Design a protein around this motif. Structure first.
Motif, PDB file in Angstrom:
ATOM      1  N   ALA A  33      -8.102  -6.055  -3.006  1.00  0.00           N
ATOM      2  CA  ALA A  33      -8.321  -4.789  -2.298  1.00  0.00           C
ATOM      3  C   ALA A  33      -9.749  -4.291  -2.511  1.00  0.00           C
ATOM      4  N   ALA A  34     -10.356  -3.790  -1.430  1.00  0.00           N
ATOM      5  CA  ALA A  34     -11.674  -3.164  -1.511  1.00  0.00           C
ATOM      6  C   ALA A  34     -11.652  -1.916  -2.393  1.00  0.00           C
ATOM      7  N   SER A  35     -10.674  -1.048  -2.184  1.00  0.00           N
ATOM      8  CA  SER A  35     -10.432   0.130  -2.989  1.00  0.00           C
ATOM      9  C   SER A  35      -8.923   0.236  -3.116  1.00  0.00           C
ATOM     10  N   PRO A  36      -8.421   0.827  -4.199  1.00  0.00           N
ATOM     11  CA  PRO A  36      -6.968   0.886  -4.389  1.00  0.00           C
ATOM     12  C   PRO A  36      -6.286   1.704  -3.313  1.00  0.00           C
ATOM     13  N   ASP A  37      -5.150   1.199  -2.859  1.00  0.00           N
ATOM     14  CA  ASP A  37      -4.283   1.948  -1.967  1.00  0.00           C
ATOM     15  C   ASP A  37      -3.722   3.134  -2.740  1.00  0.00           C
ATOM     16  N   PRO A  38      -3.693   4.331  -2.129  1.00  0.00           N
ATOM     17  CA  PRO A  38      -3.225   5.518  -2.862  1.00  0.00           C
ATOM     18  C   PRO A  38      -1.850   5.374  -3.473  1.00  0.00           C
ATOM     19  N   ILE A  39      -0.986   4.514  -2.904  1.00  0.00           N
ATOM     20  CA  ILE A  39       0.372   4.376  -3.447  1.00  0.00           C
ATOM     21  C   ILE A  39       0.371   3.778  -4.841  1.00  0.00           C
ATOM     22  N   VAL A  43      -3.332  -5.174   6.981  1.00  0.00           N
ATOM     23  CA  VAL A  43      -3.605  -3.739   7.069  1.00  0.00           C
ATOM     24  C   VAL A  43      -3.102  -3.084   5.792  1.00  0.00           C
ATOM     25  N   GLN A  44      -3.996  -2.400   5.091  1.00  0.00           N
ATOM     26  CA  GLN A  44      -3.640  -1.701   3.875  1.00  0.00           C
ATOM     27  C   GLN A  44      -3.515  -0.199   4.126  1.00  0.00           C
ATOM     28  N   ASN A  45      -3.013   0.514   3.129  1.00  0.00           N
ATOM     29  CA  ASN A  45      -2.940   1.987   3.173  1.00  0.00           C
ATOM     30  C   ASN A  45      -2.048   2.462   4.321  1.00  0.00           C
ATOM     31  N   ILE A  46      -0.901   1.801   4.507  1.00  0.00           N
ATOM     32  CA  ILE A  46       0.063   2.153   5.547  1.00  0.00           C
ATOM     33  C   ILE A  46       1.407   2.581   4.989  1.00  0.00           C
ATOM     34  N   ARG A  47       1.593   2.612   3.685  1.00  0.00           N
ATOM     35  CA  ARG A  47       2.853   3.010   3.083  1.00  0.00           C
ATOM     36  C   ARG A  47       2.736   4.395   2.461  1.00  0.00           C
ATOM     37  N   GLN A  48       3.843   5.138   2.509  1.00  0.00           N
ATOM     38  CA  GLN A  48       3.893   6.450   1.865  1.00  0.00           C
ATOM     39  C   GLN A  48       4.187   6.320   0.380  1.00  0.00           C
ATOM     40  N   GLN A  49       5.016   5.350   0.000  1.00  0.00           N
ATOM     41  CA  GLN A  49       5.344   5.050  -1.388  1.00  0.00           C
ATOM     42  C   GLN A  49       5.293   3.535  -1.562  1.00  0.00           C
ATOM     43  N   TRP A  50       4.981   3.071  -2.774  1.00  0.00           N
ATOM     44  CA  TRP A  50       4.856   1.624  -3.003  1.00  0.00           C
ATOM     45  C   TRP A  50       6.183   0.911  -2.809  1.00  0.00           C
ATOM     46  N   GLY A  51       7.302   1.582  -3.085  1.00  0.00           N
ATOM     47  CA  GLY A  51       8.619   0.960  -2.978  1.00  0.00           C
ATOM     48  C   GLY A  51       9.097   0.736  -1.550  1.00  0.00           C
ATOM     49  N   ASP A  52       8.407   1.261  -0.562  1.00  0.00           N
ATOM     50  CA  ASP A  52       8.850   1.155   0.832  1.00  0.00           C
ATOM     51  C   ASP A  52       8.559  -0.255   1.333  1.00  0.00           C
ATOM     52  N   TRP A  53       9.598  -0.960   1.744  1.00  0.00           N
ATOM     53  CA  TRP A  53       9.475  -2.383   2.047  1.00  0.00           C
ATOM     54  C   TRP A  53       9.918  -2.752   3.451  1.00  0.00           C
TER      55      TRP A  53
END
Length: 358
Positions: free
Chosen positions: A225-231, A269-279
């Protein structure tokens, strides 16, 4: 390490996914997008043996690969997923697994393995790489408070052992599923995970065919990752390369020179989840880095596409008996059909949002 199972082989392309993609590309009305979509049929994916009913199809794939090898002067490699444990997916709200522990599940699973072995034995000129049981052993690290998982523990271990021991006898290269950075990559989960995987490797006899672990199967994490995903806040291992760099030395310390494969099929595509557990059918996903052995890491044998993009993860219909409410969350694409069936709108977005572009 010195033996990368993919070096010197051509990968046999799944006819089933090819047929799904061909049908899908005809339904795409923009002629340029249709052309790009058609080309996905030439990208290697894994074939999932998620029921005994698929074992005869494996036999046809091996025989076709053997003949293609002879026709072209190449050596062919078939990529499969073993995914039929009894009481499968013990921590999930719904499971499509056909076997149950209470109805002779272990014996049925062993027969499933024996039938797979019987097919593989007939085509020794074809190399097989297998991912062993997604969504299995990772539950025994973090989900033992789920009663279904606690009750399944000894069966999961015995069934995985049977698979590893018996597939090794026919020369199958195996990678056991190891979750992803947001599951086992938490620093506190690394040592319990390494202890479990090492125990399993030891119990199966430390066969060289047990090559290592597969990560990110059917998930969406970046490799790098370029920068961490907020999740990911709170976890320093915010992508798969951090997870692998942290886990691999722990396995080496125990005597296992393990290597890894990483699913990137839906990681573009990154940074598309609201929570990390969403699959489930995460909205806006794109096809990611194409399969390659040019991975940039000592520990990674290949970037792969394990989950075939376009096949649905689960329905959003709350009246289905296979309904998993994870598939109704806001970041899930809806309406969605039943797990495993073709989800055309999702495929079209995977193509349009592919990074790198198709």
């Amino acid at each position: 390490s010195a033996n990368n199972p993919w070096t010197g082989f051509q990968i046999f392309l799944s006819p089933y996914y090819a047929n799904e993609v061909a049908a899908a590309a005809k339904q795409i009305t923009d002629p340029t997008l249709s052309s790009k979509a058609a080309s996905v049929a030439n990208i290697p994916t894994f074939t999932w043996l998620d029921s005994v009913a698929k074992i005869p199809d494996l036999g046809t794939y091996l025989a076709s690969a053997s003949a293609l090898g002879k026709s072209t002067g190449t050596k062919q490699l078939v990529q499969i997923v073993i995914y039929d444990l009894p009481d499968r997916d013990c921590a999930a709200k719904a499971s499509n697994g056909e076997f149950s522990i209470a109805n002779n599940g272990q014996a049925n699973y062993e027969n499933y393995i024996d039938q797979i072995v019987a097919q593989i034995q007939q085509f020794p000129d074809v190399r097989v790489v297998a991912v062993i049981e997604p969504d299995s052993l990772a539950n025994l690290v973090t989900n033992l408070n789920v009663q279904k998982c606690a009750n399944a523990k000894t069966t999961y271990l015995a069934c995985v052992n049977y698979a590893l021991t018996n597939l090794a006898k026919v020369g199958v290269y195996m990678y056991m599923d190891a979750g992803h950075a947001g599951w086992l990559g938490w620093p506190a989960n690394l040592s319990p995970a390494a202890q479990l995987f090492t125990q399993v490797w030891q119990n199966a006899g430390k066969s060289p065919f047990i090559k290592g672990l597969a990560t990110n199967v059917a998930n969406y994490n970046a490799l790098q990752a370029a920068s961490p995903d907020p999740i990911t806040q709170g976890n320093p291992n915010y992508d798969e390369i951090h997870y692998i760099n942290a886990l691999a030395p722990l396995l080496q310390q125990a005597g296992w020179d393990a290597t890894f494969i990483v699913d990137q099929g839906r990681s573009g595509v990154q940074n598309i989840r609201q929570q990390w557990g969403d699959w489930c059918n995460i909205k806006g996903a794109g096809f990611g880095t194409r399969p390659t052995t040019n991975t940039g890491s000592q520990f990674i044998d290949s970037i792969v596409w394990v989950k075939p993009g376009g096949e649905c993860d689960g329905t959003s219909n709350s009246s289905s008996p296979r309904y998993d409410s994870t598939c109704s969350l806001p970041d899930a694409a809806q309406p969605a059909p039943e797990a495993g069936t073709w989800f055309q709108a999702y495929f079209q977005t995977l193509v349009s949002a592919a990074n790198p572009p198709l």
